[PDB]
Design a protein around this ligand. Structure first.
Ligand SMILES: *[C@@H]1O[C@H](CO)[C@@H](O[C@@H]2O[C@H](CO)[C@@H](O[C@@H]3O[C@H](CO)[C@@H](O)[C@H](O)[C@@H]3O)[C@H](O)[C@H]2NC(C)=O)[C@H](O)[C@H]1NC(C)=O
Ligand SMILES: *[C@@H]1O[C@H](CO)[C@@H](O[C@@H]2O[C@H](CO)[C@@H](O)[C@H](O)[C@H]2NC(C)=O)[C@H](O)[C@H]1NC(C)=O
Ligand SMILES: *[C@@H]1O[C@H](CO)[C@@H](O)[C@H](O)[C@H]1NC(C)=O
Ligand SMILES: *[C@@H]1O[C@H](CO)[C@@H](O)[C@H](O)[C@H]1NC(C)=O
Ligand SMILES: *[C@@H]1O[C@H](CO)[C@@H](O)[C@H](O)[C@H]1NC(C)=O
Lengths: 22, 48, 57, 87
């Protein structure tokens, strides 16, 4: 139900969704 | 009786989520706010 | 004689290619539901553009 | 030239990218392609009508993983967001 050229980096979250689910 | 009520209530939650989506407005609002902030930041590049 | 330009008068204002995006550009367009002069010959003005059409046989 | 960070200048527009054979289908008269934020993303090769993409050649931060120097002078670098074949 829930839905790049200029230094706009998007870091990844340290806890990935599988670990949140765990 | 309590078991049946609790199970049926879980089921109603399942349905309520599965049918309407405006219950998750809170998270979607955060995501949209950040997306629009980035889009404004980028579209500022095309200004003199 | 006059008529009602329902929905016509839209042209790709530039050369780019866009996919599934709602673009918003400001240029010279034919205002919707406007007044087109039904004809069947003389001179006409050219204020800033034209939507010359035809339903020919 | 393809698959190299090149400094292209197609007939009208310029810029640096990594030209790659795409699968987008322009219309016969269109020349560019743009992104949702109005950035160039696809260019029609004005000589041979094959539509190329444009991927800005990789940049990104460089982090230096390290145990405290009170432990060792050894480190390990982390390049952010690269296919690890561009280092
Ligand atoms: C306290 O409230 C609960 C509300 O769930 C009452 O239980 C429910 O009572 C209704 C009315 O009798 C039941 O509906 C009927 O069920 C029978 C089952 O065969 C069916 O033949 C009828 O057509 C109708 O659907 C309902 O089943 C029942 N729910 C459960 C889980 O048993 C309960 O009776 C109330 N307590 C007191 C002391 O009144
Ligand atoms: C532009 O000129 C080039 C010159 O080679 C054309 O490329 C040739 O296209 C023909 C068409 O069948 C084929 O023989 C080959 O694909 C190409 N090489 C040669 C040696 O002919 C190209 O088609 C031209 N395109 C336009 C739009 O003018
Ligand atoms: C102009 O448009 C109006 C509204 O549709 C229409 O009634 C009218 O006949 C048109 N022509 C003139 C000269 O007003
Ligand atoms: C920190 O440095 C001091 C002096 O170099 C050393 O004696 C100490 O053991 C160090 N701490 C650790 C945890 O290694
Ligand atoms: C990295 O580049 C190689 C080049 O052969 C390619 O096969 C591979 O899929 C690339 N990896 C990613 C994650 O893009």
């Amino acid at each position: 139900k829930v839905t790049k050229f200029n230094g706009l980096t998007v870091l990844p979250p340290l806890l990935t969704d599988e670990m949140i689910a765990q | 009786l309590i078991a049946n009520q609790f199970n049926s209530a879980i089921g109603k939650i399942q349905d309520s989520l599965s049918s309407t989506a405006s219950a998750l407005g809170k998270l979607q609002d955060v995501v949209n706010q950040n997306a629009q902030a980035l889009n404004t930041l980028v579209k500022q590049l095309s200004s003199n | 004689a006059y008529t009602n330009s329902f929905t016509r008068g839209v042209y790709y204002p530039d050369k780019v290619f866009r996919s599934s995006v709602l673009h918003s550009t400001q240029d010279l367009f034919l205002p919707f539901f406007s007044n087109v002069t039904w004809f069947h010959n003389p001179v006409l003005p050219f204020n800033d553009g034209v939507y010359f059409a035809s339903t020919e046989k | 030239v393809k698959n190299k960070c090149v400094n292209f200048n197609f007939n009208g527009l310029t810029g640096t990218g990594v030209l790659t054979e795409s699968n987008k289908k322009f219309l016969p008269f269109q020349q560019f392609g743009r992104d949702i934020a109005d950035t160039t993303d696809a260019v029609r090769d004005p000589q041979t009508l094959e539509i190329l993409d444009i991927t800005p050649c990789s940049f990104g931060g460089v982090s230096v993983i390290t145990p405290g120097t009170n432990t060792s002078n050894e480190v390990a670098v982390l390049y952010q967001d690269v296919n690890c074949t561009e280092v």
